[PDB]
Amino acid sequence: GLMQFTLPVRLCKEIELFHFDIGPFENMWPGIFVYMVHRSCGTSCFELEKLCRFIMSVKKNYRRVPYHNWKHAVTVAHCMYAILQNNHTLFTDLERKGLLIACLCHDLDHRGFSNSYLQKFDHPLAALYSTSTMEQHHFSQTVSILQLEGHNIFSTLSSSEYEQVLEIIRKAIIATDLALYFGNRKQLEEMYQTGSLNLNNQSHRDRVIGLMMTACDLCSVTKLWPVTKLTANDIYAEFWAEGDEMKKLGIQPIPMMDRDKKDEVPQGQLGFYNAVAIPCYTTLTQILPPTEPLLKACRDNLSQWEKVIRGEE
Ligand SMILES: CCOC(=O)NC(=S)Nc1cc(NC(=O)c2c(C(=O)N3CCC3)cnn2C)cc(C)n1
Ligand SMILES: [Mg+2]
Ligand SMILES: [Zn+2]
């Protein structure tokens, strides 16, 4: 109970920053996650033994895919950690508990294919969950792992506190379905500009947690340029595999996913930053002023993608 995790000095300091990269040493990522729960939540939120057992089962159930992998899980949790730490007082004891767990769990057992590929493949999971297919899977896998023996990290919550935190986690994971992001951000835009946004309204909180989830999920666009650029390679390695599988079903993939259309990457990054990333971090920064570094770093990387187009790299 007196066993504080500590990190080497450069990590200890850099981890507080939004643009922190968790590094290539996989064996340090569990320790980094625990460090963030202890600072974000307290050293008493979770029985350490149960937490460590939970983390290692969660890790085991991420697959060896180029992008939607255990490193993505921890990177997304670290972004949520930075948001929580820069907005100390806005979040309940329960949201702080739930949201680092949701982020760690948000892509459990991902295979590196979109909902669309499953629906066109006719994957069993598309019959069981008609919308937000993978995301209902990820939540389902989260509940499975919580119900393994010695894995209930929530065991000392009351029955209703338990139900609230599993409900925070379920909405949080559903919200990582980017198809849902657009409406969620539009509504947050109106609510904030007409002045009706009320953080005491549970349905409003829900939406603000969903936008945080999109922001943390997309945080590859908010890293220093060399991190952003090398991640883009992993992201496209999955996209191109999915395009290949689309061709195998006899379907021209969208060009984003076609590996014969690599030259169009820089212009597709512009679209994505313009239609998705910048609007996301904009609305987030309006709602949560201290998250501004995410917007500023996204705009830096947009400017780095325009330089790629101008043959300046
Ligand atoms: C209905 C489908 O229609 C459409 O194409 N809409 C849209 S969102 N297209 C789209 C999205 C891109 N996304 C990214 O590059 C990306 C992601 C991302 O989308 N995901 C989902 C898994 C992680 C995360 N980080 N980064 C850099 C790029 C281009 C060229 N196009
Ligand atoms: Mg996902
Ligand atoms: Zn994700």
Side-chain angles (χ1 to χ4, degrees):
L2 295 186
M3 290 196 189
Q4 288 320 243
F5 276 63
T6 57
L7 309 172
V9 169
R10 186 199 60 88
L11 282 86
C12 180
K13 294 191 209 171
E14 255 95 326
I15 195 171
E16 297 308 318
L17 307 184
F18 282 100
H19 60 266
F20 185 56
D21 182 83
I22 60 170
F25 301 106
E26 308 209 345
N27 284 165
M28 276 181 81
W29 296 343
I32 291 161
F33 183 76
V34 162
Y35 179 86
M36 295 193 291
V37 173
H38 285 175
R39 282 197 98 255
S40 212
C41 198
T43 64
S44 29
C45 284
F46 301 113
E47 221 250 83
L48 187 40
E49 187 189 296
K50 278 162 181 293
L51 181 54
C52 283
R53 204 155 35 242
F54 179 77
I55 288 170
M56 296 313 295
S57 291
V58 168
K59 170 176 158 88
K60 186 201 299 152
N61 281 284
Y62 274 90
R63 302 179 164 251
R64 285 210 216 87
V65 290
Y67 176 66
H68 285 96
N69 59 33
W70 166 239
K71 193 178 192 178
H72 169 67
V74 180
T75 294
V76 167
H78 159 274
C79 191
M80 175 65 71
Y81 163 84
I83 297 185
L84 291 176
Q85 285 307 253
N86 282 271
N87 312 263
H88 183 52
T89 70
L90 276 85
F91 300 98
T92 64
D93 298 6
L94 275 186
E95 311 172 312
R96 265 196 279 80
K97 274 169 178 180
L99 291 172
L100 288 175
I101 300 296
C103 285
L104 190 71
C105 291
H106 86 284
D107 267 333
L108 261 170
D109 194 33
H110 207 284
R111 341 276 174 123
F113 299 114
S114 68
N115 288 340
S116 286
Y117 179 64
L118 290 227
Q119 292 154 2
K120 261 143 202 156
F121 182 79
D122 203 354
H123 193 285
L125 287 178
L128 178 51
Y129 317 118
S130 17
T131 69
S132 307
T133 306
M134 289 300 311
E135 289 83 18
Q136 299 203 62
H137 187 50
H138 308 309
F139 175 67
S140 189
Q141 293 276 292
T142 302
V143 167
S144 295
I145 284 170
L146 273 170
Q147 272 166 190
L148 261 21
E149 260 225 332
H151 287 61
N152 206 299
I153 61 166
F154 290 132
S155 55
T156 64
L157 280 43
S158 90
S159 171
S160 71
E161 276 195 307
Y162 188 91
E163 168 145 352
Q164 293 179 71
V165 87
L166 257 289
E167 199 48 22
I168 287 161
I169 288 162
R170 180 191 66 80
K171 294 178 197 156
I173 291 180
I174 291 315
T176 60
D177 180 3
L178 202 69
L180 294 187
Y181 149 68
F182 294 108
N184 183 52
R185 190 200 70 84
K186 277 152 213 154
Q187 283 280 201
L188 275 171
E189 205 48 26
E190 291 160 20
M191 278 176 187
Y192 160 85
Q193 283 175 349
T194 78
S196 47
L197 189 63
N198 172 31
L199 281 155
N200 285 300
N201 186 333
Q202 187 58 60
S203 75
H204 280 185
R205 276 179 104 62
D206 282 359
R207 298 211 165 260
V208 166
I209 293 161
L211 191 69
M212 283 159 62
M213 292 295 305
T214 308
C216 296
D217 199 30
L218 293 190
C219 76
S220 122
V221 301
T222 71
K223 295 312 174 182
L224 293 206
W225 170 239
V227 175
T228 300
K229 184 182 164 208
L230 288 161
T231 305
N233 279 346
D234 300 334
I235 298 178
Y236 273 88
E238 296 196 354
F239 285 167
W240 292 332
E242 176 165 329
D244 289 355
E245 295 297 326
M246 282 290 196
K247 290 178 199 173
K248 289 188 198 173
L249 292 178
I251 310 182
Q252 258 313 116
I254 69 203
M256 158 185 19
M257 282 182 192
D258 186 345
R259 67 172 74 250
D260 301 333
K261 290 185 179 157
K262 294 176 175 202
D263 42 311
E264 299 174 42
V265 169
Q267 192 71 58
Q269 288 299 298
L270 279 210
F272 183 73
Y273 279 77
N274 284 316
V276 190
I278 298 288
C280 167
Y281 294 114
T282 304
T283 309
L284 186 57
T285 310
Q286 293 175 171
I287 296 177
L288 296 177
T291 59
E292 193 192 348
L294 292 165
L295 175 55
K296 168 199 187 302
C298 182
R299 280 189 187 288
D300 275 336
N301 287 313
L302 172 51
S303 150
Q304 288 304 286
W305 283 112
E306 289 164 332
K307 285 160 158 163
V308 181
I309 297 174
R310 299 193 294 251
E312 292 159 68
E313 38 158 40

